[PDB]
């Protein structure tokens, strides 16, 4: 049984329903290849830089993740087509906002390029966000899920050189005995192609075996603004978040946020007002 796959154009309405019913779906061409020529061209260089997830000189280093794994996170002031064309995703939007409107507005967790180098070995089987919100493990089991992670590929995903494996279903599991990589199947996926899972989804990195190919992906998790994010844009400088939409604003944290409770009172609110009002914050402003 193979992950669904499904267009961005022509079944737009059925992604989230897909998702929520088999705990994944592949959104083909969900960005166009050149918004994945110019994203590869922004961050190639941040990535070259980056060192080991674990590098001493990291006061928050991330010892989870392989020393044959580069992570690099906080991505609009880096790039261009990030912070316009993906921030602004309609297909995004529509999948986010079907996903989460139980709970009110979302936001960016995090917007990250990550990059395998030849023979990166496959990561173990896991759900996200048990690193960084404990919280999300004492939900009830059948809580709408909180957040979902886009994992969009920036080079082709093959069996080969080390494609996501997923466990269809595995979102609904509350008993693990049967978690093993022989229920996985793969993700094999153009670039600019979409794995959509949620924060349940049971998943892993594959093992890149070729040893010559670096596959190279964009995961972005995508949570109700409840949630803190994994990564800040305090440090964005000005110019940059007053480029761009108000709705990117929100995404990265400079705006205030709403719940769906029908007398929300709001997120990040100033006295009765939101941060956008109370800083006088301009959007689309070009740099
Ligand atoms: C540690 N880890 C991340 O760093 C990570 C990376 C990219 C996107 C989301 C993300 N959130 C995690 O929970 C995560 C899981 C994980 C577990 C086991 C092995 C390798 C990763
Ligand atoms: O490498 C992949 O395809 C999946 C990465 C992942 O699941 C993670 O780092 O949380
Ligand atoms: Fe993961």
Not at 158 to 167: D, K, L, M, S, W
Request: with cysteine.
């Amino acid at each position: 049984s193979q992950i669904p796959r499904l267009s961005a154009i022509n079944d737009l309405h059925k992604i989230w329903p897909t998702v929520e019913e088999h705990g994944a779906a592949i959104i083909e061409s969900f960005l166009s290849l050149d918004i994945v020529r110019r994203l590869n061209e922004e961050v190639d260089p941040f990535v070259k830089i980056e060192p080991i997830p674990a590098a001493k000189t990291k006061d928050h280093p991330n010892h989870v993740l392989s020393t044959t794994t580069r992570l690099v996170n906080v991505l609009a002031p880096i790039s261009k087509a990030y912070r316009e064309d993906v921030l602004n995703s309609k297909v995004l939007h529509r999948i986010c906002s079907d996903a989460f409107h139980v709970y009110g507005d979302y936001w960016v967790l995090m917007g990250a390029v990550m990059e395998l180098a030849p023979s990166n070995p496959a990561q173990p089987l896991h759900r996200d966000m048990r690193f960084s919100h404990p919280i999300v493990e004492y939900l009830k089991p059948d809580a709408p899920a909180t957040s979902i992670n886009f994992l969009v590929a920036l080079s082709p995903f093959t069996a080969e050189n080390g494609a996501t494996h997923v466990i269809l279903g595995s979102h609904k599991w509350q008993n693990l005995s049967n978690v093993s990589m022989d229920a996985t199947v793969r993700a094999l996926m153009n670039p600019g192609d979409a794995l959509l899972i949620t924060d349940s989804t049971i998943h892993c990195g594959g093992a890149e075996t070729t040893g010559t190919e670096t596959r190279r992906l964009l995961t972005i998790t995508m949570g109700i603004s409840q949630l803190t994010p994994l990564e800040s844009n305090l440090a964005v400088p000005r110019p940059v978040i007053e480029s761009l939409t108000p709705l990117a604003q929100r995404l990265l944290g400079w705006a205030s946020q709403r719940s769906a409770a029908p007398r929300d009172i709001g997120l990040l609110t100033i006295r009765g007002n939101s941060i956008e009002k109370t800083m006088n914050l301009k959007a689309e402003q070009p740099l």
